[PDB]
C-alpha cells in the first residue's frame, strides 16, 4: 500500500 | 478562539496539502477526524488519509495533525460543460499519480485523448490519459476559482 515514503517526490 | 471554515467538521471529506517539499503541488484525499472545539487547546485539525497508509502492508490509514490552511473541501463535481471541455495546451490540470492529485500544466496534446503535463516543482514531464486529469481549481476566500 502507498505510504508517504512511496508517494513523496523528494 | 478560532473561527473555523464551515466545511471543516469531524467526518468531513477534504483535500489535504502538505508543507513538505516532496509534496509540493499535491492534494491527497482524506477526512477530518478532529477539529479545534470552542473548548480547545489546539488550533490544529487531525485528518485521516484515504489512500496513504502508515505501513506499506496497509493495515492503518495514515493520520496527521495539520494546520487548517492545509485543508480544502473536495474539488467541485465535474460539471456538464466540463465533461464537454477539451483539454488544451496551457491548461492548468491536476494529474492522478501515486494515489493523489498533482498540479501541472499541459504542454502537448496528442491523439486518442492523451496529453503531456509539465510539473514545475519536480521538473517532471509526464504523459497521461484524459481520464487521469482534472481541471485545476483553487479554494480561495471560501469559494472556488473558477466558481461553481
Residue numbers in the entry:
A (entry chain P): 1 to 10
B (entry chain A): 26 to 173
Paper text:
Here, we identify a previously uncharacterized H3K9me2-binding protein, which was named AGD-containing protein 1 (AGDP1). The AGDP1 protein possesses three pairs of tandem AGDs (AGD12, AGD34, and AGD56), all of which can specifically recognize the H3K9me2 mark. Our biochemical and structural studies reveal the molecular basis for the specific recognition of the dual marks H3K4me0 and H3K9me2 by the three tandem AGD cassettes of AGDP1. Our studies identify an H3K9me2-binding protein that regulates heterochromatic DNA methylation and reveal the molecular basis for the specific recognition of H3K9me2 mark, thus establishing an additional linkage between H3K9me2 and heterochromatic DNA methylation.
As an alternative, we successfully obtained high-quality crystals of AGD12 of the Raphanus sativus AGDP1 (RsAGDP1), which displays 83% sequence identity to AtAGDP1 and which also specifically binds to the H3K9me2 mark, in complex with an H3(1-15)K9me2 peptide. The structure was determined at 1.9 Å resolution. The AGD12 of RsAGDP1 adopts a classical tandem tudor-like conformation. Interestingly, the H3K9me2 peptide adopts a unique helical conformation with the four residues from H3K4 to H3A7 forming a short α-helix. The intra-molecular hydrogen bonds constrain the peptide into a contractive conformation that is distinct from the commonly observed β-strand-like or extended loop-like conformations. The AGD12 of RsAGDP1 employs a large negatively charged surface to accommodate the H3 peptide with the side chains of H3K4 and H3K9me2 inserting into two adjacent surface pockets of the AGD1 and AGD2, respectively, highlighting the important role of H3K4 and H3K9me2 in the recognition. The unmodified H3K4 forms hydrogen-bonding and salt bridge interactions with the acidic residues Glu89 and Glu45 from the AGD1, and Glu45 also interacts with the unmodified H3R8. The dimethyllysine of H3K9me2 is accommodated by a classical aromatic cage formed by Tyr122, Trp127, and Phe144 of AGD2 by hydrophobic and cation-π interactions like most reported methyllysine readers. In addition to the aromatic cage, a Glu149 residue can form a hydrogen bond with the dimethylammonium proton to strengthen the binding and facilitate the selectivity for dimethyllysine. In contrast, the AGD12 of AGDP1 uses the shorter edge of the interface between the two AGDs to bind to the H3K9me2 peptide; as a result, the peptide must adopt a condensed conformation to allow the simultaneous positioning of the H3K4me0 and H3K9me2 marks into the two adjacent pockets.
